[PDB]
Amino acid sequence: KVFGRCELAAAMKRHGLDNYRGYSLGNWVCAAKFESNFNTQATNRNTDGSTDYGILQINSRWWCNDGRTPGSRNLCNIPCSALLSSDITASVNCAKKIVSDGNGMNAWVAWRNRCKGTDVQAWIRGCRL
Amino acid sequence: KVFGRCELAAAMKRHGLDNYRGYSLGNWVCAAKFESNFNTQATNRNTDGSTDYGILQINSRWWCNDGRTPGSRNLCNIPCSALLSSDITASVNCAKKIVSDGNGMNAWVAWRNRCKGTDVQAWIRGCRL
Ligand code: VO4
Ligand code: VO4
Ligand SMILES: [Cl-]
Ligand SMILES: [Cl-]
Ligand SMILES: [Cl-]
Ligand SMILES: [Cl-]
Ligand SMILES: [Cl-]
Ligand SMILES: [Cl-]
Ligand code: NA
Ligand code: NA
């Protein structure tokens, strides 16, 4: 599923991401824009052979099982395929573990480089929340 | 689809029913409980031959077309089948027309008899909104 901006903002808010670990909703929308262009089915293979999955490009090196990342962990205890669903629940639940794990949203390279420090409220403007 | 109480409250809030025409969200949850027991597929045939459809039991006499209510109107400009979808949008959009049409939520007999005047906030307690 490819979300519209405000559509995804509402869904993310429904799923409790607004102010989660202190990150306002626009941080999460911005991260999703630049990680996946709002596409739940986004996948990208990393140099190390791991793959990133879903609207927040969660990495099979650590967070999900895809059966083809030798030596990896599955810290969210989910198949990576679950992160490609139209239903963003598995992605959100795994993102909550990631953001709680010490480095906050810096785990998302695109957030650090493109969203951090910026006017992230812009990402939720015009949206009914 | 049979909604859970808090699930339906969130959906109704997403769809702008909270405070719509001055009716707080718990009015709408209460009405849905007693009209349909939260079941989008609820149907009931009236004495006059019209049928009521969906989570808010909208009547084919006035509001939707079902092809079998002679002499009726279709004021929401929708097939009655649309009011049975798991996606409550058509029901909500048609309910907004009904509640705006002069008698407010009194159009729903179950609301008038069972919800009106009561502690409707109870219907949204324990819910993340
Ligand atoms: O394509 V990935 O480099 O974001 O882990
Ligand atoms: O079953 V109906 O009497 O609510 O219009
Ligand atoms: Cl994801
Ligand atoms: Cl693996
Ligand atoms: Cl942090
Ligand atoms: Cl309905
Ligand atoms: Cl008809
Ligand atoms: Cl009124
Ligand atoms: Na893995
Ligand atoms: Na009709």
CA distance, residue A26 to nearest chain B CA (Å): 18
Q: Which residue of A6, A14, A17, A129 to mutate against B (max B Cβ within 10 Å)?
A: A14
Cα A92 from chain centre: 7
d(CA B59, CA B111) in angstroms, rounded, equals: 15
d(CA B124, CA B129) in angstroms, rounded, equals: 8
Q: Which residue of B14, B87, B89, B129 to mutate against A (max A Cβ within 10 Å)?
A: B14
Contacts of A64 (CB under 8 A, 6+ apart): A53, A58, A74, A76, A78, A79, A80, A82, A83, A94
User: What is the C-alpha R_g of chain A?
Assistant: 14
- Taking alpha carbons only, the member of A106, A92, A112, A128 closest to residue A34 is A112
d(CA B20, CA B40) in angstroms, rounded, equals: 21
CA distance, residue B116 to nearest chain A CA (Å): 27
Residue whose token pair is 């991401």: A17
Residue whose token pair is 């009106």: B116
Residue whose token pair is 């006017």: A119
d(CA B128, CA A48) in angstroms, rounded, equals: 40
Q: Helix-strand-coil percent breakdown of chain A, rounded to 5?
A: 40, 10, 50
Across the strands, what pairs with A65?
Answer: A79
Give, to the nearest 10 degrees, the angle between helix A25-36 and helix A5-14: 130
Number of domains in chain B: 1
Contacts of B79 (CB under 8 A, 6+ apart): B64, B65, B66
d(CA B15, CA B9) in angstroms, rounded, equals: 10
The whole domain housing A46 covers: 1-129
Binding site per annotation, positions of A: 101
A7 is known as an active-site residue = no
Sign of the torsion formed by the C-alpha atoms of B44, B47, B49 and B50: negative
E strand spans, A1-129: 43-45, 51-53, 58-59
Contacts of B47 (CB under 8 A, 6+ apart): none
Instruction: Identify whether the C-beta of residue B62 lies closer than 8 Å to the C-beta of residue B73.
Output: yes
d(CA A37, CA A70) in angstroms, rounded, equals: 28
Give, to the nearest 10 degrees, the angle between helix B5-14 and helix B25-36: 130
Q: Is A46 in the pocket of ligand 1 (CB under 6 A)?
A: yes
User: How many C-beta atoms surround the C-beta of residue A98 within 10 A?
Assistant: 21
d(CA B93, CA B2) in angstroms, rounded, equals: 19
Sign of the torsion formed by the C-alpha atoms of A74, A75, A80 and A82: positive
Is the CB of B128 less than 8 angstroms away from the CB of A16?
yes
d(CA A17, CA B77) in angstroms, rounded, equals: 37
> What is the domain-level CATH number for residue B23?
1.10.530.10
Give the angle B79-B83-B89 at the CA atoms, nearest 5°.
Answer: 110
A48 is known as an active-site residue = no
